[PDB]
PDB file of C-alpha atoms in Angstrom:
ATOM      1  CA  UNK H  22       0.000   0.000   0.000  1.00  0.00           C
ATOM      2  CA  UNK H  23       2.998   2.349   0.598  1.00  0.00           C
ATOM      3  CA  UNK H  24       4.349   4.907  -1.957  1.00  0.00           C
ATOM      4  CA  UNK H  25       7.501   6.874  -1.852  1.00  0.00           C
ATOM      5  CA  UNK H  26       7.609   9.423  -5.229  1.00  0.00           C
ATOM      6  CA  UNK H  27      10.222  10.663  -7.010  1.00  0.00           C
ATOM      7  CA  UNK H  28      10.096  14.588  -7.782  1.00  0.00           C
ATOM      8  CA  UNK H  29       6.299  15.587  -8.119  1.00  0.00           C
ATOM      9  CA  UNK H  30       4.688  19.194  -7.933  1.00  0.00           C
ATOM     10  CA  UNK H  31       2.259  19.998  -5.375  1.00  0.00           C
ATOM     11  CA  UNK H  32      -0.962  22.086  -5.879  1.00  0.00           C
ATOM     12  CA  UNK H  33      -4.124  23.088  -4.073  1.00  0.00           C
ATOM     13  CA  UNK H  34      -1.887  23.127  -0.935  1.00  0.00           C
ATOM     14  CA  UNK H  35      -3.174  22.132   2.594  1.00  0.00           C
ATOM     15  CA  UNK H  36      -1.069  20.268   4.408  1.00  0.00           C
ATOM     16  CA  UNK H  37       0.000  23.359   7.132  1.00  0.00           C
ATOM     17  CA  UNK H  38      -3.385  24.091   8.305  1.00  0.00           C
ATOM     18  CA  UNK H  39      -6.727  22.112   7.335  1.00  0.00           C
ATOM     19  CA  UNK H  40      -9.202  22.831   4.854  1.00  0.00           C
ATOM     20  CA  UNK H  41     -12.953  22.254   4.328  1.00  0.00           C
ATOM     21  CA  UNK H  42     -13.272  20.728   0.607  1.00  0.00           C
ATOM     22  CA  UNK H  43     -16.774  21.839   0.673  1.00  0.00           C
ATOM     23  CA  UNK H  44     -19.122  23.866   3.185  1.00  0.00           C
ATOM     24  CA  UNK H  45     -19.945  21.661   6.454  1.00  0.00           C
ATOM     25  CA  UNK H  46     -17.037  19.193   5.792  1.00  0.00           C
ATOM     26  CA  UNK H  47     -14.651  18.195   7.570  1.00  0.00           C
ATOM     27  CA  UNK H  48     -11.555  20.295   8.133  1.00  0.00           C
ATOM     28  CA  UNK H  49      -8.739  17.721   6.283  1.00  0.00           C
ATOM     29  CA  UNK H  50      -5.094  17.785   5.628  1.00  0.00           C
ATOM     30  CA  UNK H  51      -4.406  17.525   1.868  1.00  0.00           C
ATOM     31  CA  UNK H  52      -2.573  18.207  -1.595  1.00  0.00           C
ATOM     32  CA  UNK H  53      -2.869  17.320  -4.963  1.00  0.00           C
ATOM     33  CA  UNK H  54       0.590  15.795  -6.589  1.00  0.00           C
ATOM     34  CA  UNK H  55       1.330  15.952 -10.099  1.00  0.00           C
ATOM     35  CA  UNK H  56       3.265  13.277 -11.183  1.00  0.00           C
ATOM     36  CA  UNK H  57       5.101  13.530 -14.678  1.00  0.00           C
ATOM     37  CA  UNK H  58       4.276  10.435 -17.282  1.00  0.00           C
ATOM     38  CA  UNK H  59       8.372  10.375 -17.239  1.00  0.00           C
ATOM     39  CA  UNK H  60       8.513   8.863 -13.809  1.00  0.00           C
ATOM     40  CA  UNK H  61       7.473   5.045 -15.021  1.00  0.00           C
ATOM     41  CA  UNK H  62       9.264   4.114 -11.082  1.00  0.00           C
ATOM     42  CA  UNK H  63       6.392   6.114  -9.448  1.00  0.00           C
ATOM     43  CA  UNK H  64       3.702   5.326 -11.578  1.00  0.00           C
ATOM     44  CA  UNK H  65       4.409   1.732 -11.228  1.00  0.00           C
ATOM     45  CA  UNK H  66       4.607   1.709  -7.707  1.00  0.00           C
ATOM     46  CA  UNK H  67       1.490   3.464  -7.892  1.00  0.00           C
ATOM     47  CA  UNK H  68      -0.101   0.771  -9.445  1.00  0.00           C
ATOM     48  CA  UNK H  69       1.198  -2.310  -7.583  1.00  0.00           C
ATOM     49  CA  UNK H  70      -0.123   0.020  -4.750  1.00  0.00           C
ATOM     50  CA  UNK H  71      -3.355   0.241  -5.820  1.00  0.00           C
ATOM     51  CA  UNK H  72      -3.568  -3.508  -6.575  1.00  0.00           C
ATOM     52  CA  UNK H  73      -2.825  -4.404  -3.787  1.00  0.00           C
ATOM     53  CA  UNK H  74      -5.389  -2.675  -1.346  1.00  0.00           C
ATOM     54  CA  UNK H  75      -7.611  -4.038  -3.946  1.00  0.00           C
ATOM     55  CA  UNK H  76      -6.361  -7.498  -3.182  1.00  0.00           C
ATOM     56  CA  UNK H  77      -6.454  -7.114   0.530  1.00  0.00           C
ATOM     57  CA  UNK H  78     -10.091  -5.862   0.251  1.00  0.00           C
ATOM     58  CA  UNK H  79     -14.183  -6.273 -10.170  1.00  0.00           C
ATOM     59  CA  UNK H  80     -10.726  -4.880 -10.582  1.00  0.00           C
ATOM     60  CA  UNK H  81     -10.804  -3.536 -14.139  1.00  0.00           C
ATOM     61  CA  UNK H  82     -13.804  -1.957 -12.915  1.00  0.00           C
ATOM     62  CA  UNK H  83     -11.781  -0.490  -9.984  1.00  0.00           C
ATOM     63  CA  UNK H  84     -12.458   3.244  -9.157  1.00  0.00           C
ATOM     64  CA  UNK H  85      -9.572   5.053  -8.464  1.00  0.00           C
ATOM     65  CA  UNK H  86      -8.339   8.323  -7.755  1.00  0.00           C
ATOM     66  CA  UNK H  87      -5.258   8.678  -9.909  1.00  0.00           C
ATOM     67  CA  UNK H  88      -6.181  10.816 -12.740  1.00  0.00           C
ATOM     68  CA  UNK H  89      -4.462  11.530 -16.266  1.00  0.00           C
ATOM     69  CA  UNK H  90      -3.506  15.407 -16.608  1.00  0.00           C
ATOM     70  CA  UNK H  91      -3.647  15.458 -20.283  1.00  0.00           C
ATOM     71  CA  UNK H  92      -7.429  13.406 -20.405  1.00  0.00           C
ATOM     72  CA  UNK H  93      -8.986  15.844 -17.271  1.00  0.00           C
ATOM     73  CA  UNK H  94      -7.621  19.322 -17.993  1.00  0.00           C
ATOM     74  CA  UNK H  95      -7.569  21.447 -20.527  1.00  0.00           C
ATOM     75  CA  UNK H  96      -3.443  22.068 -20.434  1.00  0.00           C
ATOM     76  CA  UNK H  97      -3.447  25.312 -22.241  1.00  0.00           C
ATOM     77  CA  UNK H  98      -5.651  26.891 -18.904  1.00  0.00           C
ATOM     78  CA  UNK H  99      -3.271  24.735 -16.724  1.00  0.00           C
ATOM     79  CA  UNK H 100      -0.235  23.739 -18.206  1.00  0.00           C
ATOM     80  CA  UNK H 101       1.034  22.324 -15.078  1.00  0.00           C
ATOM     81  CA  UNK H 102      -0.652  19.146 -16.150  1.00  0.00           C
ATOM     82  CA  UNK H 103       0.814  18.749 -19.140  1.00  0.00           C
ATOM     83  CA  UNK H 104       2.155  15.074 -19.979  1.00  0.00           C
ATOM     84  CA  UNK H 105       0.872  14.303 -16.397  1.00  0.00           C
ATOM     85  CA  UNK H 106      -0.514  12.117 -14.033  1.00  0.00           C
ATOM     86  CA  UNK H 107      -2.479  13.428 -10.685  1.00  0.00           C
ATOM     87  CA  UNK H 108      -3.681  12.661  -7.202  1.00  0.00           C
ATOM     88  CA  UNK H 109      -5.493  14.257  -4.437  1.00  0.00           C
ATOM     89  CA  UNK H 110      -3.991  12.763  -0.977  1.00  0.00           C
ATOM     90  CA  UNK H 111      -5.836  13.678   2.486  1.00  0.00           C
ATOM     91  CA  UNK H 112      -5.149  13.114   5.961  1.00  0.00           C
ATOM     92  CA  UNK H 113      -7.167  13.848   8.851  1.00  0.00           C
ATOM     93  CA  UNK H 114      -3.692  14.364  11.203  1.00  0.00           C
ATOM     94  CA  UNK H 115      -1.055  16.608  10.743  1.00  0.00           C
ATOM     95  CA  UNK H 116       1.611  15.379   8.367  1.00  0.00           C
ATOM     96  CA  UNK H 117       5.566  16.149   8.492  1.00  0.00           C
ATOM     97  CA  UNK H 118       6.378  18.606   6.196  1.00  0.00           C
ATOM     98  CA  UNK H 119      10.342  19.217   6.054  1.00  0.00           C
ATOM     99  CA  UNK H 120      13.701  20.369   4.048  1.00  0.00           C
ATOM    100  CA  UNK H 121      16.827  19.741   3.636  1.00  0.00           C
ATOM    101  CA  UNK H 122      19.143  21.713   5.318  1.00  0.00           C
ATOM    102  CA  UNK H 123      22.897  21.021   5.435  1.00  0.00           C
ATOM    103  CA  UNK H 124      21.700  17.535   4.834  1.00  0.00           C
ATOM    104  CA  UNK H 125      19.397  17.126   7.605  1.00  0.00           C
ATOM    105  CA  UNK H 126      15.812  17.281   7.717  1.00  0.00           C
ATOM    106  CA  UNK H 127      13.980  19.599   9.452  1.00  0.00           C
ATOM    107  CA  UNK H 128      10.828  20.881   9.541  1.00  0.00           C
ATOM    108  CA  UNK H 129       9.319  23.846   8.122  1.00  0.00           C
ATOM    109  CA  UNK H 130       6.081  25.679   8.009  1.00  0.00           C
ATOM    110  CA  UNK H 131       7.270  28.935   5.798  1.00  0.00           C
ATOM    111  CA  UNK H 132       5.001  29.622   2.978  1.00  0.00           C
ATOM    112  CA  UNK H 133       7.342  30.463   0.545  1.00  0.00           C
ATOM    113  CA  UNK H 134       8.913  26.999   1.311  1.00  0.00           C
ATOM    114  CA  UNK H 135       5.831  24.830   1.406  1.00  0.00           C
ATOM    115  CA  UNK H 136       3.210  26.328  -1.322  1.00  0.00           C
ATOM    116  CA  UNK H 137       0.698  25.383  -4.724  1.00  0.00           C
ATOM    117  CA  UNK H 138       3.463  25.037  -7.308  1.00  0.00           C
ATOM    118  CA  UNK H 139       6.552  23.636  -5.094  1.00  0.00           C
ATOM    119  CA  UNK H 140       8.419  20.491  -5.923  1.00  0.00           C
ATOM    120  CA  UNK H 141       8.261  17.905  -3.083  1.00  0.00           C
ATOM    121  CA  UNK H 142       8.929  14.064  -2.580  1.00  0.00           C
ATOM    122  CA  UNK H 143       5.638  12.769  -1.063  1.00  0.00           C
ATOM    123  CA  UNK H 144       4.873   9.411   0.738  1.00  0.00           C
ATOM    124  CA  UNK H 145       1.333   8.550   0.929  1.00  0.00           C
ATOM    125  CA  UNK H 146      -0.719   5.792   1.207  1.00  0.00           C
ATOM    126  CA  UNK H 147      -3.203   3.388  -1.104  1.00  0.00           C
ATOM    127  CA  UNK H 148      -6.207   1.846   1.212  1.00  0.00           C
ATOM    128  CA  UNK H 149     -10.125   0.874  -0.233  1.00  0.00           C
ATOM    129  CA  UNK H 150     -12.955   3.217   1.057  1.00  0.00           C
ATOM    130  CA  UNK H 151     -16.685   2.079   1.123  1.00  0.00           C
ATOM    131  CA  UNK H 152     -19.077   5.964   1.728  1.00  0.00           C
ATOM    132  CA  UNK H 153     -22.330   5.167   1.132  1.00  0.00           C
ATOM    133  CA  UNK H 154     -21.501   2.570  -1.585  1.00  0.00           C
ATOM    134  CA  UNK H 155     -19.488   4.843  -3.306  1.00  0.00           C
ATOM    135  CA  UNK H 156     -16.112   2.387  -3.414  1.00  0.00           C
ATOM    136  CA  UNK H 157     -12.637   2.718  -4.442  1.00  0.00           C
ATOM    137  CA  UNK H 158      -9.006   2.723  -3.597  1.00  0.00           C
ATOM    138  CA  UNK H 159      -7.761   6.103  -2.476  1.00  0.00           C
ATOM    139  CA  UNK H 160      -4.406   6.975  -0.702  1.00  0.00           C
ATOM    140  CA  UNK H 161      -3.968   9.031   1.959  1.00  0.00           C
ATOM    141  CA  UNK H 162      -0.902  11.625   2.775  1.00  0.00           C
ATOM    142  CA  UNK H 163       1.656  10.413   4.604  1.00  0.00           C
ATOM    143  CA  UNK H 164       4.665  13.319   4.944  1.00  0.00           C
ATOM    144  CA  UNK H 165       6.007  15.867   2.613  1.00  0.00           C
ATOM    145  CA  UNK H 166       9.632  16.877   1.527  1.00  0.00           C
ATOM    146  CA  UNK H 167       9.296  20.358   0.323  1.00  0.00           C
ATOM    147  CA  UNK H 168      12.524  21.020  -2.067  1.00  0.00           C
ATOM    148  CA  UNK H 169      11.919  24.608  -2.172  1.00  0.00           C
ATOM    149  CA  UNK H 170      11.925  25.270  -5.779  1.00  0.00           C
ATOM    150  CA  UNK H 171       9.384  25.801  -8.362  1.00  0.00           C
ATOM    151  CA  UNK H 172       6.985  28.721  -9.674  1.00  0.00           C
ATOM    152  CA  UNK H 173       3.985  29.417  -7.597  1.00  0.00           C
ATOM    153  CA  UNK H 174       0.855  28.240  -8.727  1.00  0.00           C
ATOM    154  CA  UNK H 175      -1.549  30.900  -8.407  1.00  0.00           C
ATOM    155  CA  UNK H 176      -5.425  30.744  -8.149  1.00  0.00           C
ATOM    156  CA  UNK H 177      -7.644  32.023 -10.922  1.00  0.00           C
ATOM    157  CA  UNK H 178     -11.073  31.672 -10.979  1.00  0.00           C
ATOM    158  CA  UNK H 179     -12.994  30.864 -13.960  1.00  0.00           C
ATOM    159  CA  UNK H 180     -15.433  32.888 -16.079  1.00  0.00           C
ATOM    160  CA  UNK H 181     -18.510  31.095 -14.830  1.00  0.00           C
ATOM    161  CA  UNK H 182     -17.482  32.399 -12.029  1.00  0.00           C
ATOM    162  CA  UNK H 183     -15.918  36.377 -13.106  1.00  0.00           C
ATOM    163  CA  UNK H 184     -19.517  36.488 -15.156  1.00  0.00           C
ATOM    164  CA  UNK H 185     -21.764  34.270 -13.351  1.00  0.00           C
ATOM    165  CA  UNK H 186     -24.207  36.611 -11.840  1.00  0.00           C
ATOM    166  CA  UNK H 187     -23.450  39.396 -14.338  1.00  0.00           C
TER     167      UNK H 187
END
């Protein structure tokens, strides 16, 4: 069940303080990764992941929450997911979020260290939900590695939004 990426890039970034995904919710710990279609070693572990909470719990009719970039998103709005793979990983606790620093690890909660756009190393988790018969294998966050580089990955809101109303 246990995954341990290679370089991804995080967005929608929540893993300092919770967040409500929608209204009433439950605050959560969370992040999307984007995983490049390069990185066959992560992709792969992924997978033999995923099969195997689906072992321990009709596979080709398996939900699952690892999504293709270039399928889901239109990659001229959101290049980011270009030639990608991506994943939305949760935790109800607080994960470890660290850096390196003179080659130790320490932790850090500075937002221009740990923020939507960074490069990170992830470990996170594959398990089989059942929520009101909606069923699946999902993975959970484990602990980020922030490696403090990348462009940030700003919100903009869309036009049915901007014109919605009027």
């Amino acid at each position: 069940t246990k995954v341990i990426t290679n370089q991804v890039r995080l967005s929608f970034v929540h893993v300092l303080e919770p967040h409500a995904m929608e209204e009433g919710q439950e605050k959560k710990y969370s992040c999307m990764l984007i995983i490049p279609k390069d990185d066959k070693e992560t992709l792969k572990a992924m997978k033999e992941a995923i099969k195997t909470a689906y072992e321990g719990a009709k596979f080709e009719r398996l939900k699952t929450t690892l999504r293709d970039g270039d399928e889901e998103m239109d990659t001229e709005e959101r290049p980011e997911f270009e030639n990608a793979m991506f994943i939305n990983v949760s935790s109800k606790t607080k994960p470890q979020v660290v850096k390196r620093e003179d080659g130790v690890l320490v932790k850090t909660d500075d937002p221009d260290e740990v923020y939507s756009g960074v490069y990170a190393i992830a470990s996170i988790n594959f398990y089989a939900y059942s929520t009101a018969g909606n069923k699946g294998v999902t993975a959970g966050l484990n602990n980020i590695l922030t490696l403090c580089k990348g462009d940030f990955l700003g919100g903009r809101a869309n036009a049915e939004s901007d014109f919605g109303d009027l």
